[PDB]
Design a protein around this ligand. Structure first.
Ligand code: KX9
Ligand code: KX9
Lengths: 304, 304
């Protein structure tokens, strides 16, 4: 028992972290096989970031200008290309620590672990969710660009995110491993609107099921609701509308606890309308939305 | 910017995780050099745990009874000894992935990362604090025993905790790597009182400084207080009394933000007396005490 915001073990990803330097800028790269992936803004100076012409900036760069270092050993760059907002540096050596991996584009509301790095060295790991507005509320300082988000299934690392920038609002934006930004963001030093964010309803419900499993039951009530009625409350409190797909994904937790999904929705409706009244759920005084139904089942069963 | 409950990268520790089986019981072991460390209750059956005589139970065991497996390879056990509540199994092979390491006994209020494991395989990593009452609020299921807590400085892993048991209250108890329990706990299936816990005052203040650094400033006020006055409020709200040692450790954060430690205490006093009034601090609706002043400086500076 006990419920924690758990990240995946970061070992397989630590073994891929490298440092990439181009001119004056240093950031993190991800070495998989004979390719080093990093944000393309490594080629910019501070002056360039206001409105960079990446195609023109990359044209002035040669393979020998990209300095790639894995710990204390230097990698020889034999090719360079830009794919969307990432640079792919072909190196003459395949990473011996390359794990089984995939590049995946996660859906908003899905979770992942981030291995925050500086100068190609890992500093820490934390679990986070891709917000419905395609931002992440991470912990990243100058030099953290190129740190990646991932999930691990058995022995396969699914890379889903690469960190690129901090918006003026202090929230973070980045790309999938093909360099496509999540959301409307562009890699330029300009004020950029992150849309209206919402609370991930299915994740809050999954976390209410984790609470019941772990003993916190005070919020359970004598009520039920319908998808329509619950969604009128969800709209009022800026929660994602709940669908039958969400109900179906909550099936295993509903089956394990014996609490019908619409009964749990009625509990959530009462918590939204009355607050927590100074009480806590799983050590939190707010409704947690960074645990997916799969995360809850994984943590409550012990998947390694 | 951004503040997250960050765990250390777990790679160095993943490389040490092994599975230890004795009779019918399987749990996790930590392989460092030619020694495998695991909880001594691996030698007990379910019937034994009510009141085990470990010295007698271990006497019926030989080196060949301890089955140690690192992934898919079996380790040859050439020695066995009990030190307090841990068994040390000497193996004929030094772990090639043994990092630079120390065994340390942490102080209550200090933090550490846990690599939760099952059958010698890592499932996840999370940051937690050793409560003032010497328990941890972890996330551990059956099979997690032998999972360890650690901190990492540069390249050195300081192992501070090994998981042994879950109290009937759902909180966790374990030992240092010399097998000495933190707190009054014994390794037997008996109801055991965890003392009155308190909130780690210095950590809450360190986290209030992290909030100001990251932009959350609404709680700052026009007041100040004294150590004596603040401690009368701390006693009323079950907070650890603040000492000059705590004030001194907050020196760097006080210097960075320009907010005197006693001024921050006055902010904490007002938050304790009036609550958060439905507002949040760093995404939390309660006062967070699992970040030490060193954690805050490390996260806000980017130590790798
Ligand atoms: C310079 C970088 C960035 O946002 N870095 C960053 C990333 N994450 C946290 C903090 C920073 N810090 C930026 C200044 C100081 N730190 C950047 C700027 C504009 C656009 C793009 Cl794609 C990338
Ligand atoms: C059996 C084990 C234990 O507490 N394991 C555990 C540890 N952590 C989480 C859950 C468990 N679960 C126990 C039953 C089901 N799970 C134990 C019992 C009595 C004393 C000692 Cl030192 C160790």
């Amino acid at each position: 028992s006990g419920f924690r915001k758990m990240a995946f073990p970061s070992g397989k990803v630590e073994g891929c972290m490298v440092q990439v330097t181009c001119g004056t800028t240093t950031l993190n790269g991800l070495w998989l096989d004979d390719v080093v992936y990093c944000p393309r803004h490594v080629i910019c100076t501070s002056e360039d970031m206001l409105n960079p012409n990446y195609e023109d900036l990359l044209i002035r760069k040669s393979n020998h200008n990209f300095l790639v270092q894995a710990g204390n050993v230097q990698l020889r760059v034999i090719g360079h290309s830009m794919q969307n907002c990432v640079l792919k540096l072909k190196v003459d050596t395949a990473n011996p620590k390359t794990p089984k991996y995939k590049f995946v584009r996660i859906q908003p509301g899905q979770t992942f672990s981030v291995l925050a790095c500086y100068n190609g060295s890992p500093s820490g790991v934390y679990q986070c969710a891709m917000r419905p507005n395609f931002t992440i509320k991470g912990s990243f300082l100058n030099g953290s660009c190129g740190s990646v988000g991932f999930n691990i299934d058995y022995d396969c690392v699914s890379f889903c995110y690469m960190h690129h920038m901090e918006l003026p609002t202090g929230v973070h934006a980045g790309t999938d491993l093909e360099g496509n930004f999540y959301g409307p963001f562009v890699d330029r030093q300009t004020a950029q609107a992150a849309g209206t964010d919402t609370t991930i309803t299915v994740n809050v419900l999954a976390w209410l099921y984790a609470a019941v499993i772990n003993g916190d039951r005070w919020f359970l009530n004598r009520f039920t609701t319908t998808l329509n009625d619950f969604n009128l409350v969800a709209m009022k409190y800026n929660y994602e509308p709940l669908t039958q797909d969400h109900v179906d994904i909550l099936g295993p937790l509903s089956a394990q606890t014996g609490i019908a999904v619409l009964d749990m929705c009625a509990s959530l409706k009462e918590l939204l309308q009355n607050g927590m009244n100074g009480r806590t759920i799983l050590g939190s005084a707010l409704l947690e939305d960074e645990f997916t139904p799969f995360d809850v089942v994984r943590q409550c069963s012990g998947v390694t």
